[PDB]
Design a protein around this ligand. Structure first.
Ligand SMILES: *[C@H]1O[C@H](CO)[C@@H](O)[C@H]1O
Ligand SMILES: *[C@H]1O[C@H](CO)[C@@H](O)[C@H]1O
Ligand SMILES: *[C@H]1O[C@H](CO)[C@@H](O)[C@H]1O
Ligand SMILES: *[C@H]1O[C@H](CO)[C@@H](O)[C@H]1O
Ligand SMILES: [Zn+2]
Ligand SMILES: [Zn+2]
Ligand SMILES: [Zn+2]
Ligand SMILES: [Zn+2]
Lengths: 150, 149, 154, 154
């Protein structure tokens, strides 16, 4: 099972080094094969003008070929690149999992923590089971990633 | 039969912006003969109202012929980005609008995050990229060419 | 009899349409109170991506305007509010200028439940009655019951 | 070298994983220089979506810390930089405080070709040599020929 790991964390040197590996490892510990686009497609700096299109199509192909997206949606607002990747995944009926350990709210509605469009690929009732608020919660057996694999 | 454009924007969140910014954009698009689906105009005390709105706009994106995405702001609005991502995966026509002179980018080719342009051609993507309301009418940009050619 | 000076901090000058359509109605609503409005994009001529030769002078001119104003009227629309406006608002707090905030955007971008935005934005406002300094529509600017009018006539 | 007080403004206390993993190495880097670090999340206890009757005290405590510090070390990562950091940075500029910026985020969020961010962030810096106060990595906080080090002496 393949999870595309969409995040803004590859943009900060400290975040790329410290925040992503514990997330990657939590997902692998479930049995998941993890596609992390920043390393997988080598976007390590302000992309040169002649490599940007290639980087874009590579990330696009991974979203089309994965089985689920694990979208890190921290920030005010969530990262625009993550959001494009999230909309692709929804449109392609891929499995959808959201991660937000940022306690700030950035929402246009009183029902969801974020803009209601991010949850358009999640059920009306138990969308909370797909919404992870802590790295240590990724392992949880009562949450939709585990049940997705079992 | 008019081509259908879904007009994604954050302009419905501000009272003044909804009233003053969106009508001129709609008019410019309609002057091209387009049928405009503007989600704020298309749209309350219920519990499931947010879910129903998400499903309603999702249906509209699925059924449009193209998206015209207002990508002003730093960064572009996350709801527009989700809708733009849907439109790219569903092979809809893609047009971007930004009259904001600020750059919010991860690369030197594009003035925005490169994934916003992933559904556009490698060369000539500028022809789909509108930088002023006055430019929407241009017979030399992709919207007119797509309506005719 | 010198008019009171309001510095109108906003991100609206970055967008051609916003600059042309959103700012003049706000300027008028303030001028209708007898206020002299300092709108930095027009005053200090930041009309496109500033050339390198010029960005320092734009910064110092806006900075000096904040120093010389009597109050700041901060457009704090957006998720999150604009970083330039926020710098100009922090300056105005520190310099004991009058503070008024404008947000007609109904989205919330906050780190707390007491205030609709980041808590620091209200650090220069009283603990009780801060809502009086927080405007949520251009039409509300005129309110003889809100803080801007009371500051002018007080 | 003198034991100056640095206010470490950042958005990193908002995320559980960032508060735990990203702040301590930055605090330790500043403390390796002999600086007294005032980190507002720990020091004024903002740990979650703040309770309404506590929010005003948090704002006033962070404001007082900015008033009583010697300089600000502003984490200005993100698109755009955090509005709370930006308010606290505007205060520091107007309060005559030493100004140090850092960003290891390689994205651009700018209104000008001279600076990688909104030009107002760099207003309290000099026209020539602002790069001195701009740290793009954590190994660079150490460096004796940047701004922090030199300020700690003269
Ligand atoms: C998908 O595209 C973006 C550019 O690499 C990146 O953020 C990834 O999430
Ligand atoms: C699609 O974008 C709109 C504004 O962000 C929102 O309604 C979403 O449905
Ligand atoms: C201060 O106000 C504006 C908001 O970004 C900015 O241009 C500066 O000129
Ligand atoms: C000052 O810094 C923090 C970052 O936003 C803000 O919440 C306030 O504590
Ligand atoms: Zn939002
Ligand atoms: Zn960006
Ligand atoms: Zn915020
Ligand atoms: Zn910016």
């Amino acid at each position: 099972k393949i999870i595309y790991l969409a995040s803004p964390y590859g943009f900060s040197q400290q975040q790329k080094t410290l925040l992503l590996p514990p997330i990657v490892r939590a997902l692998e510990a479930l049995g998941i094969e993890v596609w992390e686009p920043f390393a997988r497609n080598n976007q390590i700096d302000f992309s040169q003008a002649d490599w940007a299109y290639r980087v874009a199509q590579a990330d696009l192909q991974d979203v089309k070929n994965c089985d689920g997206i694990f979208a890190v949606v921290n920030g005010t607002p969530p990262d625009e690149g993550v959001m494009v990747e999230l909309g692709m995944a929804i449109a392609l009926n891929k499995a959808i999992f959201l991660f937000r350990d940022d306690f700030r709210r950035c929402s246009d509605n009183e029902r969801y923590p974020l803009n209601l469009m991010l949850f358009a690929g999640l059920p009306e009732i138990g969308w909370e089971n797909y919404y992870y608020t802590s790295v240590d919660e990724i392992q949880s057996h009562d949450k939709a990633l585990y049940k997705w694999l079992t």
